[PDB]
Structures are given as structure tokens and as C-alpha cells.
């Protein structure tokens, strides 16, 4: 009887299984039975990231109304549209549409979507689940696939295998190994990169000096786990938050290279489905870029794409600032950086001090010097208060946060420009991966406003200190020494060093046994763009056949999501409703390819 396997039962594997069930009546012949084997060491639907047994202190970064695992009539795919509830609709008044759910609540939605998919399965499809890791994949003698699980079971005779493996562990860097050894010699705690939900922070004591190395979304999780996760609470008075200490908190120090907590997301005013529709990086502009990459002269990100992104953002900022119907048609007719930009702005009442400045938004401390810790702290509090107040105006009427939310909305169009070798390799390396991607995350993949208002109260209470720009950490007898070379008096000896970031996708350093096996035996390879090696596993165009060391696309193997980062840009994002989600149309295309390779 026919069999297939899905490796990974997080959102992407669950979505493949829902799309398999949707198309199986059209693409399997009458009377044919298909067994789908679903393999995850975590209960299926939520997988490891969204498991319901995690701490309720940890939040999503997406509003509840924009979280779904179901296709909708906007989605351009070949399988049938099967409407279901968003997290907000399913949650039955437990959460507001513009509020941020707990990660455990998304888990409970995902466990229910999985149980519902088994209830709605057509009679041609039997699902079998396996609480296990897959550790080897091989060709059988007839060309069907063998999948070996770490519980000693082997699945044989498979017509197809889908790898939906998401956020995988990585072997520690040389720096992470030196710091782990230093912790062993001096009885310290070193916590390497990980989902904050997976780390044991109960080993940190009250009053202990702790460095969070990182100021991004992992930082905001550890900030919550070491405060409200230890009996801390907040109270609001005259608009303004105050932190109420439990006495169990450590002394929290934090820093990074840029030295700033990530920007607050503007409060959502676009509803469940609202997206900035591009007027500079248009589908017409994107088609022309894809035509040049196709004919072998790929665009340069900095020369050719960045000026369109910059114009897109600046136009939205100025349009929200000027609020006159005639302004934007006149501004959009001007080329990016033309001298008439400045003169048109002056004519609509915009002074030189309200003008966009990419250098200031990137490093807003760089005009000034800091004489001691105290001057850094007062500057930083002023900066975070202004950030929270811009975010309260929302992502439609607030000019700054409307403009930075363009960067979140444009990801669809940037993916179509840069994915599948749409850039030259040297531009991919030096412009996208080393400059745009980290700036973009700082500006547009930051926390809810509430997290910036909490951090500000923690800074006022002295429970958190941010050390300052260009964080330096050195190993000493009995501690690490952390300082900012831009903030005199910032030096502090800590006894816990937390690397507050996730492992990035890296096939070359993977700690997954299955991909290490495929890499050693020449059955997968790193995606390469003109001599630049990315961290991504190489796949064909949709429906994403796995490509072997010699460049051969496998007919029975497909890989989908985070492990393809390099082929694809910003894979670490769920489906949104009403916007022709590529995550949903990719799941549908992968499911239909699996059913066609089985259904011969
Ligand atoms: C901490 C964190 C917070 C996030 N917050 C948000 C957010 O707020 N909003 C948002 O849109 N996105 C968020 N994301 C992005 C995330 O990438 C997606 O939401 C989504 O989880 C990706 O789904 P996936 O199935 O590709 O990967 P994952 O959710 O990582 O699921 C992969 C699954 O595959 C399993 N697996 C891997 N290897 C094997 C193997 N060899 N055998 C068997 N099973 C295997 C794992 O156990 C895991 O269950 C977040 C990610 C993380 C890590
Ligand atoms: N709340 C949530 O839902 C949540 C929680 C956690 C994770 N996530 C998901 O996971 C993704 C990654 O989160 P993240 O916190 O890893 O990344 P992130 O949000 O981009 O923050 C990474 C931080 O680490 C610093 N940094 C990065 N690489 C470093 C390195 N090699 N050495 C030292 N410092 C380094 C960066 O600051 P500099 O930039 O100056 O170095 C930055 O402060 C998010 O984008 C999101 O998709 C979401
Ligand atoms: N339209 C086909 C595949 C394709 O040719 O794109 C499908 O039915 O899935
Ligand atoms: N995944 C996209 C939206 C979509 O599903 O196309 C995002 O980055 O938020
Ligand atoms: O420069 C920016 O990014 C914002 C414009 N401003 O003057 O606030």
C-alpha cells in the first residue's frame, strides 16, 4: 500500500498534511489508500517551538488576528480553498485582535488544527504519528525511500519524504566552546544559543550579575523569564508602568554590537488583512529584476534594489507627516535622492529637522559622546520613551512606525527579488546578509510596544542595565568582564553569560543527525550563489526538490522552510491571512507534488 512521510510536525509539516488531505480526492485514483507517516519528537501540530507545556510568560511577535494555518480565497494555489479560523476567531474571546498571544496559546490552536485535520481526512488517507527523531534517509534498491527513526523503527517503501525541520540545533562556534570551557574551569553558567523557552534559568540566583549578550527578541524573552517569571509584576499609574520587584531577580546586564533594544512595532491599525501595497518595488519592477537574473546579469542589492526600498519607506513616512492628497503623486514622480525631493518637502511644510535620516535611525547615539554609565542611561531612557510614544500612534497615522512597518509588509516583494539566486553572490554576502538583514530585523522585527514600556520600567527600577554600544566580553579568573568602549564605567564582572539569540540555519555546522548524514553521503549540499556559500540546504524551484552534491534534483524528496534560508529570505515567519501567503501556497504545491509522485 502507498506510504509517504512528513519529517517535522510544526506549523509547516502540519500545513503540508492539511494540503495533502485537501488534494487527495482529486489526485489519488479511486480505491487507492495512502498512509501519511508524521514524525516529530514533539507532539504534532505545535511541534517543539509552540509546544503547550512551555512557560506562559513567553509571547508571540504577531497579533492574534494575523495568525492562521488555513488557506483563504486570496491564496493563489491549485488545491481547494478550505477556510478555517484564525487564532483570534478560534480563541473565543480569550484575546483581542491586535493583542499578542502567548506561545503556548498558539500551541493549543496548532494541536487543535492537527486533531481537526485527522477528523476531516478523506477515507483515502490514514495518518500514523511517530514520537521520534528521523536520523537517516536513503534510497531503497527500487528507488522508494527508507527513513530510519531513533526509536529503532525504519519506515520502508516510501513514495516520498517532506523535510519540514524548522529551527535546527547547530554545533557550537569556536567562541561558544571557549566560553563553555571557561564556565567549567570557574564554576560559572554559560548558556549557548537556543529558544529561551528551552533553557533552565532556575540555576541563576537572586542578585547574581548576568550578561544577556543580545538585545533582540531572545533578549525580551530572557528579560521576562528573569523578572515576571520570578514573581515580578507591573502596575500602571498616570499612564506610566512601574516594576514591583519580588526580590528573586538577578542583576541583569545586557548589550550588543549596535547596543540598542530592537524598535517597538507600531500598534496595529491595519486590521487582520491590511498590508502596504508597494508603489516603488511594484510587481512590474520585480518582473524586470527577475528577467535580468534569468538572462544572467542579476541586480546588485545596494545599486538597484535598496533605492526602491528606501523610496518606499520614506514616501510612506512623508505622506503620513504631510496628510495632503496632492503630496504623494508629486513625491513618487521624483527619483530617489533627486534634489527636487527636498524642495517639494519644503513646499509642503516639512523642515530639515523632520527629514528621514537612515544613519540616525540605524545608530541614533552616534552624534554624541558619553562621559559615564549615568549619561548613557539618561540618553537611553529618553530614546525608549520616544520609541514607545511613536509606537502608540500606530502603524497607519504614526509616520515613523507606518514607514518602518513597510519593511515588514514588503518582505513578499523582496523575497521575489532575492530568492533562488536573484542577487549576485558578492551582493548577497556583503549587502543582504551582512547589512540589510540585521538592520531590517532591528527596525521591523522588534517587540510589541508593551515590551519597550516594561524594559523602560526595569531600567528606572535598576533591575536591568544596558551596557552600551560595541559590547566587549573577555574571560577573567572567576568571571567574564563585560563593558562598552563607548560608556566609561560600564565594566562589570558577571558569573552567568547568556547568548541571547537563536542558532542561525547552517547546513555546514548542523547538529541534526539526518542532515549531517545527507551532507556526508553527498545527498544534499549547501546552496551556493556565484561562489558565496550560504547556510541553506539547496532545493530546486517550487516544489523544492532536494539537490544532491552533483546538482541532481531528487524526484521523491522535498524540503520546505527554515533550513532553506539562503535559497529563501526570512523563512522564520508564519502565514498571514488575506495576502496570498506564499507559506500556504508553498505547502499546497509540495503536497500536490507528493501526491503526484505517489499516485502514478
Ligand atoms: C522562539 C521563536 C519565536 C517565534 N515567534 C514567531 C512569531 O511570533 N510569529 C511568527 O510568525 N513566527 C514566529 N517564529 C517563526 C517560526 O519559524 C514559525 O512561526 C514556524 O514555527 C516555522 O514552522 P516550521 O514548521 O518551519 O518550523 P518549526 O516550528 O521549527 O517546526 C519544526 C519541527 O520539526 C521537528 N523536527 C526537526 N528535525 C526533525 C527530525 N529529524 N525528525 C523529526 N522531527 C524533526 C522539530 O521537532 C519541530 O517540531 C518564531 C520562532 C521561534 C524559534
Ligand atoms: N517574541 C517572539 O516571538 C520571539 C522570541 C525569540 C525569537 N523569535 C524569533 O527568532 C528570530 C531570531 O531572534 P534572535 O533574538 O535570535 O535574533 P534578533 O531578534 O535579530 O536579535 C539578535 C541579537 O543578538 C545580537 N547578535 C546577533 N548575532 C550575534 C553574534 N553572533 N554574536 C553576538 N551578538 C549577536 C544582535 O545585536 P547586534 O545586532 O548589534 O549584534 C541582536 O541584538 C526572531 O526574528 C523571531 O523570528 C521570536
Ligand atoms: N497546476 C498544477 C501544477 C503546475 O503545473 O503548476 C497543479 O495542479 O498543482
Ligand atoms: N510569511 C509572510 C506573509 C505571508 O504569509 O506571505 C510574512 O513574512 O509575514
Ligand atoms: O530619521 C528617521 O528615521 C525618522 C525621521 N525623524 O526625524 O524622526
Residue numbers in the entry: 2 to 601
Give the original sentences from the paper that presented this experimental model:
Nonetheless, we noticed that the crystals could stand prolonged soakings in solutions comprising sodium tartrate, PEG4000, 15 mM L-aspartate, and 5 mM NADPH with no ammonium sulfate being present. We further observed bleaching of the crystals indicating that the enzyme was reduced by NADPH. This procedure thereby allowed us to solve the structure of the reduced enzyme in complex with NADP(H) and L-aspartate at 2.1 Å resolution. The electron density unambiguously showed the presence of a molecule of L-aspartate with the side chain carboxylate overlapping the position occupied by a sulfate ion. The ligand is engaged by several interactions mainly with the arginine cluster (Arg13, Arg276, Arg416, Arg577, and Asn413). The critical observation is that this position of L-aspartate cannot be conducive to the oxygenation of its amino group which remains too far away (∼10 Å) from the flavin N5-C4a locus. Therefore, we shall refer to this site as an “entry chamber”. For oxygenation to occur, the substrate should bind more deeply, inside the “catalytic” center wedged between the isoalloxazine and the nicotinamide-ribose moiety of NADP(H). We could not detect any bound L-aspartate in this site even after prolonged soaking. In the L-aspartate structure, Asn62 is flipped “outwards”, vacating the space in front of the flavin.
FzmM and CreE catalyze the triple N-hydroxylation of L-aspartate to nitrosuccinate. The crystal structure of Streptomyces sp. V2 L-aspartate N-hydroxylase outlines a characteristic helical domain wedged between two dinucleotide-binding domains. Together with NADPH and FAD, a cluster of conserved arginine residues forms the catalytic core at the domain interface. The Lineweaver-Burk plot of the initial rates revealed a pattern of lines intercepting on the horizontal axis, suggestive of a ternary complex mechanism. Thus, Streptomyces sp. V2 L-aspartate N-hydroxylase operates as a typical class B flavoenzyme monooxygenase: it is a single-component enzyme that binds simultaneously FAD and NADPH and retains the pyridine nucleotide coenzyme throughout the catalytic process.
